[PDB]
Amino acid sequence: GEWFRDNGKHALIVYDDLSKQAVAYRQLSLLLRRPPGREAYPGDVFYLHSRLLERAAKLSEKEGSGSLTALPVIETQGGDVSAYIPTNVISITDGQIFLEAELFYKGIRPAINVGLSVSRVGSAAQVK
Amino acid sequence: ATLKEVEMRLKSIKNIEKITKTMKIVASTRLSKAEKAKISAKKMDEAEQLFYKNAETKNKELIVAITSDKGLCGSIHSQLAKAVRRHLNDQPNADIVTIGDKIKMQLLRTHPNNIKLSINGIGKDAPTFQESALIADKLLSVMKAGTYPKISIFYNDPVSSLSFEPSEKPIFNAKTIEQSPSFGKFEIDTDANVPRDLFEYTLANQMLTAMAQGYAAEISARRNAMDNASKNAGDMINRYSILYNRTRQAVITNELVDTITGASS
Amino acid sequence: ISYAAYLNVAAQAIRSTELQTASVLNRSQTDAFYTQYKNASEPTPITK
């Protein structure tokens, strides 16, 4: 994706999904015998994602105004947004789209929870 | 699922349960007040109503439906509206006046054009003659009540504290009082319209009698309603507390495992 | 003024410091409001 960003074009990247990536990263670590942290993940499982998603950016003019936009996906269990890895990534990104099964079945699709959903960039990146 | 979730749900019901039970004693208390309003209006019901039996009074129709503004009282408004509806087939061209919002809501979902006046903010204190009389004053004025050949009062009749009975009773206008079979059994002074007064007084009175019984019927239903709410609310609390304790114990074990795994290396 | 209303005035003058209990006062006060209904919408709410 960065090739496009670096060379004055625009790329969107979708990481589907980072829940599963962390699980893999844990496997590596455990078998390498790196002493685990919370829920058996590596101590730096936040850094795993934080450095990844920091690479999505809008570059300056001196760098040709190219951009990489990230839509990472995260899976919760039983609506537990308060879970470990969900909490990490929420604190990384610039806003969240929150989908609810309860809304899916009331007919609301996309099942977006407006109350909980934000996009911090706000009306700076919305058509006037 | 999570202790934090189960903590709030358990504590939420723990309140609903204490709520419904506080509203079940507030009901029981208000019930001593209720019979002092029922009996004292059922006795004024023998005396007021007896004239009409002896005079043998009989008879576009005006329906007055009576319940209240407040829910949490079983099927009080549901089946009363069902009695009015059942009656409303036999004459769909009736004009409805609603005393209470809950009953207004019920009949507005089914007969919105028939409703011409709604009396509000009722269910709070016990019914008084002032409300009774001022509603009556509105019917006579705005609804032009005196001109309908038929007036009906629907209200709940409290047979006991365990169940009630949706009821009906008629209010006779001046014309009908005058022309009754045995109206000339009484030495009535033919002068200053007595049938007029007797009608407009009975219009307030039998409304109050109705409200006073409907009230009593509601308070005894709300009590029984809260009584089961508290029973279920309390039974749920047991199942959730049990769930809590599992989830508490599980949180201790799982933290202890992480810590043991971490030290293992 | 209807005959019931006429009787209220007299009954509530028969009221209007002691012997003037709680349920006595609260018989001289009504929280009720009337709202007329047509076609249903209404003719804006008013005290009784």
Q: Quote the DSSP letter at residue C15.
A: T
> Is residue B217 within 8 Å of residue B76, measured between CB atoms?
yes
Touch between chain A and chain C (3+ CB pairs, < 8 Å)?
no
> Is residue B55 within 8 Å of residue B181, measured between CB atoms?
yes
* B6 residue type, one letter: V
Domain boundaries C1-48, CATH class: mainly alpha
CA distance A98 to A27: 28
Closest chain B residue to A33 measured between Cα atoms?
Answer: B265
B198 shares its domain with B76: yes
CA neighbor of B175 nearest in space, from B59, B52, B33:
B59
Q: Where are the alpha helices (DSSP H) in chain B?
A: 3-54, 76-89, 101-108, 129-141, 174-178, 194-264
Q: Which helix (H) or strand (E) holds B121?
A: none
Chain B contact for C18 (CB, 8 A cutoff)? no
The CA-CA-CA angle for residues B79, B156, B133, to 5°, reads 125
b/e code B69-90 from CB counts within 10 Å (16+ = b)? bbeebbebbebbbebbeeebee
Question: Which position has the token pair 């990104």?
Answer: A93
B153 shares its domain with B242: no
CA neighbor of A99 nearest in space, from A81, A123, A126:
A81
Q: Which chain B residues touch C if contact means CB-CB below 8 Å? A: 108, 112-113, 115-122, 124-126, 128-138, 140-142, 196-197, 200-201, 203-205
The CA-CA-CA angle for residues B66, B67, B70, to 5°, reads 155
CA distance B127 to C27: 8
CA neighbor of B194 nearest in space, from B215, B212, B168, B174:
B174
DSSP string, B138-205: HHHHTS-GGG-S-EEEEEEE-SSSS--EEEEEE---HHHHHT-TTGGGS---SSS-HHHHHHHHHHHH
Checking DSSP bridges between strand C46-47 and strand C33-36, what pairing results, if any? antiparallel
B91 shares its domain with B162: yes
Chain B contact for A1 (CB, 8 A cutoff)? no
- Parent domain of B14: 1-25+226-265
Neighbouring residues of B242: CB distance < 8 A, sequence distance ≥ 6: none
Based on the residue annotation, tell me whether A120 is a catalytic residue of this protein. Answer: yes
Chain B residues in contact with C30 by the CB 8 A cut-off are 128, 130-131, 134
B80 shares its domain with B13: no
- Angle subtended by helix axes C3-13 and B129-141, to nearest 10: 150
> Is residue A95 within 8 Å of residue A119, measured between CB atoms?
yes
Q: Which helix (H) or strand (E) holds A11?
A: strand A10-15
B248 shares its domain with B205: no
Cis, bond preceding B197 (omega within 30 deg of 0) = no
- Provide the 3-class DSSP secondary structure of residue B10: helix
Contact C3 B196 (CB under 8 A): yes
DSSP string, A27-86: HHHHHTTPPP-GGG--TTHHHHHHHHHTT--BPPGGGTT-EEEEEE----STT-TTSHHH
B114 shares its domain with B13: no
CA distance B200 to B195: 9
Neighbouring residues of B195: CB distance < 8 A, sequence distance ≥ 6: B174, B175, B177, B178
Q: Which chains sit next to A, with 3 or more Cβ pairs under 8 A?
A: B
> Is residue B102 within 8 Å of residue B70, measured between CB atoms?
yes
For position B251, which CATH number holds? Answer: 1.10.287.80
> Is residue B73 within 8 Å of residue B164, measured between CB atoms?
no
B150 shares its domain with B250: no
> Is residue B41 within 8 Å of residue B236, measured between CB atoms?
no
B160 shares its domain with B230: no
Question: Which position has the token pair 């349960």?
Answer: B17
CA neighbor of B65 nearest in space, from B100, B41, B39:
B100
Question: Domain ranges in chain C?
Answer: 1-48
Closest CB to C40 among B112, B126, B201 = B112
CA neighbor of B215 nearest in space, from B25, B80, B96, B46:
B80
Q: What are phi and psi of A11, to 5 degrees?
A: -130, 140
> Is residue B177 within 8 Å of residue B199, measured between CB atoms?
yes
For position B167, which CATH number holds? Answer: 3.40.1380.10
Token duo for residue B104: 């207004």
b/e code B223-252 from CB counts within 10 Å (16+ = b)? bbbbeebbeebbebbeebeeebeebeeeee
Closest CB to B2 among A38, A39, A80 = A80
- Provide the 3-class DSSP secondary structure of residue C47: strand
CB within 8 Å of chain B, chain A residues 6-35? 33, 35
> Given phi > 0 = left and psi -120 to 50 = alpha, else beta, which region is A40?
left
CA distance B12 to B236: 11
Give me the number of domains chain B comprises: 2
Gapped junctions in chain B, after residues (C–N > 2.5 Å) = 59
B17 shares its domain with B60: no
CA distance B141 to B136: 9
Sheet holding B62-66, edge to edge: B165-170, B151-157, B62-66, B95-99, B115-120, C33-36, C46-47
B116 shares its domain with B245: no
B112 shares its domain with B37: yes
Identify the burial level of C31 via C-beta atoms within 10 angstroms of its C-beta, where 0-12 means exposed, 13-18 middle and 19 or more buried: middle
Q: What are phi and psi of A15, to 5 degrees?
A: -95, 100
CA distance B253 to B265: 19
